[PDB]
Amino acid sequence: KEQFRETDVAKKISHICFGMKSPEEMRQQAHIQVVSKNLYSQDNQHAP
Amino acid sequence: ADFDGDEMNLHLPQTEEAKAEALVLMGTKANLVTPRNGEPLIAAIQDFLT
Amino acid sequence: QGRFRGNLSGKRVDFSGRTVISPDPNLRIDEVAVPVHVAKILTFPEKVNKANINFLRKLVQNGPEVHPGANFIQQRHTQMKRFLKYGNREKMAQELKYG
Amino acid sequence: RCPDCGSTELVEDSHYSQSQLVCSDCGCVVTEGV
Amino acid sequence: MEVKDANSALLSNYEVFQLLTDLKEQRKESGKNKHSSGQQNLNTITYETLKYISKTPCRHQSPEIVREFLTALKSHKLTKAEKLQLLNHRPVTAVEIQLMVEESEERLTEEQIEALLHTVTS
Amino acid sequence: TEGRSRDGGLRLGEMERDCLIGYGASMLLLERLMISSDAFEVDVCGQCGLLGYSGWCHYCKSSCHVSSLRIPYACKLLFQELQSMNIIPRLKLSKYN
Amino acid sequence: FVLVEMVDTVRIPPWQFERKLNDSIAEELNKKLANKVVYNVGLCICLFDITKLEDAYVFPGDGASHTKVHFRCVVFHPFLDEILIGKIKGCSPEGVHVSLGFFDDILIPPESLQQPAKFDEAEQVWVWEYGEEIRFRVVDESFVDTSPYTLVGSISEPGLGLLSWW
Amino acid sequence: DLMTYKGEVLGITRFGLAKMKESVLMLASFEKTADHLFDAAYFGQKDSVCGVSECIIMGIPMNIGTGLFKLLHKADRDPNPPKRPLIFD
Amino acid sequence: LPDVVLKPPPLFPDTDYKPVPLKTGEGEEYMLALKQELRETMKRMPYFIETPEERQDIERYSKRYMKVYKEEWIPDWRRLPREMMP
Amino acid sequence: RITTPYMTKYERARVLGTRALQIAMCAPVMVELEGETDPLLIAMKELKARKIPIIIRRYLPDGSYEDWGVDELIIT
RNA sequence: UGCUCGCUU
Ligand SMILES: *O[C@@H]1[C@H](O)[C@@H](COP(=O)(O)OP(=O)(O)OP(=O)(O)O)O[C@H]1n1cnc2c(=O)[nH]c(N)nc21
Ligand SMILES: Nc1ncnc2c1ncn2[C@@H]1O[C@H](COP(=O)(O)OP(=O)(O)OP(=O)(O)O)C[C@H]1O
Ligand SMILES: [Mg+2]
Ligand SMILES: [Zn+2]
């Protein structure tokens, strides 16, 4: 009927592990690809 | 301070635990002496010693 | 003005004021005078319990105009705040639940 | 409209340097902070 | 919220019935309005499971009877699942052990069925 | 904000932080620098250690290991800037117990 | 029905201190695991008992009492061969809709093994003659949250004879 | 003692501070922010939350002061409550 | 000037050069068949250790019938150090 | 049993703050307050009466722990 | 937003 899933847990950060990302991991993390050099549109609304 | 136009800051805690800790640890009656050498700083001043 | 020194180690906070000082020997060493104008602005969140229920009722009935009072009420069930300058403060006081 | 009473008397009244759109009937704070 | 073992120990329906009855009596003795209003699914599940176990013949059972039945079946080298099913169902007919009960081949022997019926009916 | 004309608040400088540390009022320092200044709730994925949104991790395309966490908005901005600089901080969360 | 060991960090607010800690923990665990299906475990019914209960901490945050409690709870999870007795709460063309008594309407017996007179013409016709028995075959669980049910199981009804009802 | 606890007199400057301390966050907040951050990213050094500076940065109660110990509630309870006996097993 | 692009490049850009077809012959066919036979016969070899199954549900009389049986090779403990004896 | 039997100011402050928060969250009072609308004042009264149901769990650097009751410790 | 300037601490 209903599945058991925890709502919130009192999670505490233990330690920060610094590192680096490969280009594949960067692509996976990113959502879209930015290729246009302009900022706003040509119309008078100046929409991005 | 010397009361010659000095501006001082006043903060109000927003938590009961912070309020209690400020009143206990940072109490004026509990911090009458400095930790440098134990000499009392909160004492008489001009117009009181005379 | 960096993120480590300007936004992490030392950062600006609310519920604070800055004012000039003046001497007053008639107060204790552990006491400080606060003006009514800054007192009406700096508010403290008190939780409605079985002890100060009547005091909070009286404060709400007084409202934001009179010095002893409050400015906003956040219900226990819903987190939608309510401004005391508008609405029936008497009804808001009569409908003060614990928490 | 107001989420509590459903009224449309939503006025933008800044209370001591705090921009706040609040209902003018029951005082329910609709939005606060900018 | 992790679990350590989902199959720690199997239990028959009598233990579940006793637990449900105890929870129900404790609930009706210490009913709390706000606790009940916070989650009403507990009451529904408890009541419906109790009603199902009541519809079942699980009544008229006791730990002494369960222990006697277990000791009687221990001499039949039957498996825990078989004896659990037999205790939960209380079969009064022979066909229920002949066909419905699994692992029938080489286990019935056409002579142990009478003893099984006598033990489950006693 | 900074200025009074801009409706700005006071600044608890590094010296104020040092005074609070010397006093040892840990809860007071926390309420001042985290709760009342830049309190925010973020979503961190327990698998990759990255920051999620609305209880969802776009990196792993899953939401089972995503958990909420209190964090200063300045600290979140620092983490984002480091991730942009390619210095990825991987946060390994655990129970408070 | 089977026992399952669990370890939960229960948070009790301060206004429940007058109550007994064990009773409050039991009530909270029941309210949290009432009518919910734990993945790869099954549908939990209620709390059976509490085995270990260590010290109760109080965090500098919410201020409530957090207790790590080890307990055993009863869950409905057959062993792939258990026999059950349910009631027909409907029927579909592709398969009957049997439901255990007021317990769960999730049993979906596939009609692909009975004698060769099996068909459902949507008129709630169970089967052409020559308390309904069920034999659990396999379990299956699934997740729910996948964007910014969970227990059906397979049922079998072999040529059991059923001298009482065809 | 803090200056001469590693067997060598280390000054309070950035060099001695880096030689004594280990918190990447503290070393970055003090001086040479980008250099220390890139060095830590290269070394893959994991930084704990034991220090006061990183505690304040992450917004958690520091270990020093009132946060060194923990408090327990004196609730009416009974450790290891009686267990219900299993009849079938 | 370089023109502005509205949509991103295709995830898999087309190429006018195609891979050269594979070499044909009885030798290549026999090598393929032998590699397939090795794939099929090396999984059942005792050296191919499988993940030990655990968490058995129950014990049954059909356990002896469904018991997986397979001969196990005996390593040479004279050549292998003593740290690998069971 | 090896630590100092006196209750430090940090412990005093933390216990008072926790008790004030609990009382503000509708916790039962064990001193029968007489018109005290301040949770911190109620907590100070409970501390002076030695009726705060809180046990300090002092942790040693190595990992060991020891429990000390408020009524067991010495106040100033 | 950035910066500069002039100022009380
Ligand atoms: O940085 C400032 C300031 O922090 C921020 C404050 O917002 P407002 O500009 O006051 O917006 P408001 O809501 O008041 O106006 P509107 O009704 O929405 O149109 O804005 C930034 N800011 C203010 N003035 C600025 C300026 O002239 N130039 C730059 N760069 N930033 C400005
Ligand atoms: N740059 C600054 N940094 C820190 N504090 C300052 C600074 N400028 C002024 N102050 C504040 O003002 C005070 C300085 O006053 P002080 O120098 O003692 O007297 P004065 O200004 O010499 O007066 P007289 O000339 O002696 O009459 C102390 C300090 O808190
Ligand atoms: Mg001056
Ligand atoms: Zn992830």
Side-chain angles (χ1 to χ4, degrees):
Chain A
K1 299 184 293 184
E2 184 65 10
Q3 183 178 0
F4 175 74
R5 63 182 303 276
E6 186 64 13
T7 59
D8 295 322
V9 186
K11 293 294 187 64
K12 178 183 176 181
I13 175 169
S14 61
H15 51 267
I16 304 176
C17 299
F18 294 90
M20 305 179 63
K21 266 177 185 179
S22 62
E24 292 71 5
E25 299 181 353
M26 294 181 184
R27 169 181 280 272
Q28 184 177 2
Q29 174 58 18
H31 295 63
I32 58 175
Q33 189 180 356
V34 176
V35 294
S36 180
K37 61 181 179 61
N38 296 123
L39 302 179
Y40 306 95
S41 60
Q42 297 299 140
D43 55 65
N44 55 17
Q45 290 78 9
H46 295 280
Chain B
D2 40 357
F3 299 142
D4 54 353
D6 302 4
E7 305 179 12
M8 300 194 66
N9 306 336
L10 178 142
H11 306 74
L12 179 60
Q14 306 299 288
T15 303
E16 299 295 349
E17 300 181 1
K19 174 181 178 180
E21 289 190 359
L23 181 54
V24 174
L25 303 178
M26 305 195 305
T28 307
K29 302 184 292 182
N31 293 329
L32 298 176
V33 293
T34 175
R36 180 178 60 181
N37 52 18
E39 296 179 359
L41 298 186
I42 296 90
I45 206 58
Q46 54 177 127
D47 295 70
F48 300 153
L49 296 170
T50 300
Chain C
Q1 292 72 9
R3 304 294 170 275
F4 292 94
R5 300 183 62 183
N7 295 116
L8 284 174
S9 299
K11 65 187 77 180
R12 299 177 179 277
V13 308
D14 44 61
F15 292 104
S16 59
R18 182 181 181 86
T19 318
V20 190
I21 51 174
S22 57
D24 189 0
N26 295 334
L27 275 60
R28 296 174 58 86
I29 61 179
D30 59 356
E31 294 181 354
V32 64
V34 183
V36 173
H37 306 82
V38 177
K40 289 181 176 179
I41 299 179
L42 270 60
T43 62
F44 181 86
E46 184 65 11
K47 297 181 178 60
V48 178
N49 55 26
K50 200 183 298 305
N52 58 27
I53 171 56
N54 301 121
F55 189 80
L56 295 179
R57 286 175 186 277
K58 183 173 66 175
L59 266 53
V60 171
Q61 291 178 0
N62 295 17
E65 298 296 347
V66 185
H67 168 262
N71 296 336
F72 305 91
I73 291 177
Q74 182 179 357
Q75 299 301 141
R76 180 182 178 181
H77 305 273
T78 176
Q79 298 181 358
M80 300 269 71
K81 296 182 177 61
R82 305 177 65 87
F83 199 178
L84 295 181
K85 187 170 66 178
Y86 305 93
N88 187 263
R89 298 189 301 274
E90 286 68 5
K91 184 264 289 185
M92 295 177 184
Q94 291 179 2
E95 295 186 359
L96 292 177
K97 300 292 125 182
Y98 298 155
Chain D
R1 289 179 172 274
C2 177
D4 294 339
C5 63
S7 180
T8 182
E9 299 294 350
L10 310 185
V11 60
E12 176 62 16
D13 192 331
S14 300
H15 178 62
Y16 290 131
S17 63
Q18 182 179 357
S19 60
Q20 178 175 101
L21 177 61
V22 63
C23 178
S24 181
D25 297 2
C26 69
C28 175
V29 178
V30 180
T31 55
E32 58 180 2
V34 60
Chain E
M1 305 298 90
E2 67 283 1
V3 295
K4 304 299 184 182
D5 186 2
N7 300 329
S8 60
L10 283 295
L11 75 179
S12 61
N13 299 20
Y14 175 75
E15 295 79 352
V16 182
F17 173 80
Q18 187 64 285
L19 179 63
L20 290 173
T21 52
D22 299 330
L23 293 178
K24 184 181 179 181
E25 61 86 0
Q26 294 297 344
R27 178 193 59 80
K28 64 178 65 178
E29 289 179 0
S30 61
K32 306 299 180 182
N33 54 18
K34 184 160 61 176
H35 301 351
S36 59
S37 61
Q39 285 285 29
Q40 298 182 356
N41 58 335
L42 200 180
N43 311 74
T44 58
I45 185 59
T46 50
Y47 183 82
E48 298 298 354
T49 311
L50 183 61
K51 188 66 179 64
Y52 170 80
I53 299 173
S54 73
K55 290 184 180 184
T56 58
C58 186
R59 293 91 60 86
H60 299 65
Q61 291 296 341
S62 60
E64 291 75 6
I65 295 172
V66 174
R67 292 296 305 177
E68 290 178 1
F69 189 72
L70 178 60
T71 54
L73 293 192
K74 275 181 176 179
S75 61
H76 302 164
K77 70 174 70 60
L78 302 181
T79 184
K80 219 74 187 176
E82 283 176 347
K83 58 174 60 54
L84 179 62
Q85 292 179 354
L86 291 177
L87 179 59
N88 296 333
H89 305 148
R90 291 155 292 277
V92 303
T93 61
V95 65
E96 289 171 327
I97 311 181
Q98 294 301 86
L99 212 175
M100 275 56 91
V101 171
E102 292 73 1
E103 305 297 347
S104 300
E105 299 181 0
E106 204 269 347
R107 285 294 189 86
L108 311 180
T109 64
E110 302 295 349
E111 57 81 16
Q112 192 60 222
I113 307 305
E114 287 69 5
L116 291 173
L117 293 176
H118 297 175
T119 52
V120 69
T121 56
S122 300
Chain F
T1 52
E2 308 181 0
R4 178 178 181 275
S5 302
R6 311 178 188 275
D7 303 330
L10 277 297
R11 179 175 167 85
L12 283 296
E14 300 180 1
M15 302 185 303
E16 287 70 4
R17 182 179 61 84
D18 303 332
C19 292
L20 295 177
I21 289 172
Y23 279 118
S26 180
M27 294 306 309
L28 178 59
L29 181 64
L30 180 62
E31 179 275 350
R32 289 281 75 185
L33 273 57
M34 189 277 289
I35 302 179
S36 301
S37 56
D38 55 0
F40 192 83
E41 300 179 0
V42 299
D43 300 330
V44 183
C45 182
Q47 183 177 359
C48 60
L50 301 178
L51 303 179
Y53 61 96
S54 61
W56 172 268
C57 181
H58 181 268
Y59 181 81
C60 298
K61 298 294 185 299
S62 182
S63 178
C64 63
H65 297 161
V66 179
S67 301
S68 180
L69 177 62
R70 297 272 292 184
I71 188 179
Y73 194 88
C75 186
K76 191 269 289 185
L77 180 63
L78 175 60
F79 287 166
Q80 293 188 340
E81 291 178 0
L82 296 176
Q83 291 185 11
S84 306
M85 294 176 63
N86 195 20
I87 300 170
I88 310 304
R90 304 182 186 277
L91 313 181
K92 181 179 178 61
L93 302 181
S94 58
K95 279 66 65 174
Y96 193 91
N97 299 329
Chain G
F1 301 151
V2 66
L3 295 173
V4 180
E5 298 276 2
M6 295 183 64
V7 188
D8 292 3
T9 302
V10 183
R11 173 261 181 179
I12 297 175
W15 60 270
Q16 295 186 12
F17 288 172
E18 69 286 357
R19 288 290 304 281
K20 194 175 188 301
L21 185 62
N22 296 338
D23 301 330
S24 54
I25 290 288
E27 292 178 0
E28 206 290 333
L29 292 172
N30 291 322
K31 292 174 64 177
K32 188 182 291 182
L33 288 300
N35 274 341
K36 298 187 179 180
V37 181
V38 182
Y39 194 78
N40 293 336
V41 176
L43 191 152
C44 177
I45 300 174
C46 57
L47 172 58
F48 185 85
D49 69 333
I50 298 169
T51 65
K52 178 60 174 179
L53 189 152
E54 65 180 15
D55 54 357
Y57 292 89
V58 51
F59 301 159
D62 188 7
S65 60
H66 300 68
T67 72
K68 180 176 290 185
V69 175
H70 307 246
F71 56 97
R72 311 182 297 183
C73 61
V74 292
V75 310
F76 172 81
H77 179 270
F79 45 82
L80 311 185
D81 293 322
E82 187 178 2
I83 304 177
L84 305 175
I85 297 88
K87 186 63 176 179
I88 303 293
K89 259 63 179 181
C91 180
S92 55
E94 62 82 16
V96 69
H97 287 297
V98 72
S99 176
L100 197 66
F102 298 147
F103 197 89
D104 52 354
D105 177 72
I106 58 181
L107 306 177
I108 309 299
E111 302 295 349
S112 61
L113 69 167
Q114 201 60 223
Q115 49 86 0
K118 57 180 71 60
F119 186 86
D120 296 330
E121 50 274 15
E123 284 81 43
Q124 297 294 344
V125 180
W126 302 268
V127 100
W128 287 266
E129 300 180 0
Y130 303 153
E132 290 70 10
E133 300 186 16
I134 286 173
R135 184 172 298 180
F136 220 88
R137 284 267 65 88
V138 297
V139 301
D140 51 356
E141 296 74 6
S142 60
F143 212 76
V144 286
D145 181 70
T146 182
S147 300
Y149 296 149
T150 64
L151 180 61
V152 51
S154 56
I155 286 70
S156 173
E157 180 63 13
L160 303 176
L162 305 173
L163 76 177
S164 300
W165 49 284
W166 58 85
Chain H
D1 282 327
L2 176 140
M3 291 177 62
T4 61
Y5 83 101
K6 280 190 174 299
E8 182 179 0
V9 179
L10 302 178
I12 307 299
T13 182
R14 55 175 172 274
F15 306 96
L17 206 165
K19 289 181 179 181
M20 293 182 299
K21 304 297 186 296
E22 189 268 2
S23 178
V24 173
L25 299 181
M26 184 167 55
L27 297 179
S29 60
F30 173 65
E31 290 187 354
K32 299 177 66 176
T33 72
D35 185 6
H36 293 177
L37 291 167
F38 282 112
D39 298 0
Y42 173 83
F43 275 93
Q45 180 62 13
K46 56 176 65 176
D47 185 4
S48 58
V49 300
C50 65
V52 182
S53 59
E54 50 268 36
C55 289
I56 296 166
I57 290 172
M58 300 305 306
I60 56 179
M62 58 182 181
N63 297 331
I64 65 174
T66 61
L68 178 59
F69 61 92
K70 298 183 180 180
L71 296 177
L72 300 177
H73 181 210
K74 188 187 297 183
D76 184 5
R77 61 170 185 171
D78 180 70
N80 300 330
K83 297 172 61 175
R84 292 176 58 86
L86 302 180
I87 306 303
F88 185 85
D89 192 332
Chain I
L1 62 82
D3 57 355
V4 293
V5 196
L6 303 177
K7 284 71 64 172
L11 188 62
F12 297 93
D14 57 354
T15 58
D16 55 350
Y17 295 99
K18 303 301 298 184
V20 174
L22 291 306
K23 301 174 65 58
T24 61
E26 71 292 352
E28 288 71 3
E29 195 283 338
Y30 187 88
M31 291 178 69
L32 170 61
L34 190 119
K35 190 174 183 64
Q36 292 181 357
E37 290 177 0
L38 291 181
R39 278 200 180 92
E40 293 179 0
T41 192
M42 182 162 51
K43 299 188 296 183
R44 293 178 290 92
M45 192 68 179
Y47 297 102
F48 184 91
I49 176 58
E50 301 179 359
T51 170
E53 65 282 1
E54 71 297 353
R55 187 60 277 176
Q56 56 82 12
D57 53 359
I58 53 166
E59 58 280 2
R60 66 186 72 267
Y61 174 82
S62 181
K63 175 177 173 59
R64 305 303 305 177
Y65 296 154
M66 73 186 180
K67 178 60 177 180
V68 52
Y69 181 87
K70 178 61 177 180
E71 57 82 12
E72 180 63 14
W73 65 287
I74 302 299
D76 192 333
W77 311 112
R78 305 173 300 176
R79 301 174 64 89
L80 192 68
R82 69 169 75 97
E83 298 182 0
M84 278 62 65
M85 268 100 68
Chain J
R1 306 187 306 276
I2 61 178
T3 55
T4 60
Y6 294 88
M7 195 267 294
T8 63
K9 63 183 178 294
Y10 302 94
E11 296 178 2
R12 186 196 309 274
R14 189 171 177 178
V15 170
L16 290 176
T18 52
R19 187 63 180 178
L21 183 62
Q22 290 180 359
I23 294 173
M25 293 185 65
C26 300
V29 190
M30 300 299 297
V31 296
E32 196 271 328
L33 69 164
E34 302 77 357
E36 285 76 26
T37 60
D38 191 64
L40 181 53
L41 293 178
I42 303 169
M44 287 185 174
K45 289 178 63 55
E46 292 181 2
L47 179 61
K48 181 168 62 58
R50 311 179 71 85
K51 301 295 183 181
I52 295 175
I54 297 174
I55 301 175
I56 306 179
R57 187 180 183 87
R58 298 179 177 180
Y59 280 91
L60 302 176
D62 64 329
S64 180
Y65 67 93
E66 61 181 14
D67 299 0
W68 283 91
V70 173
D71 58 357
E72 182 179 0
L73 295 173
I74 302 175
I75 62 182
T76 59

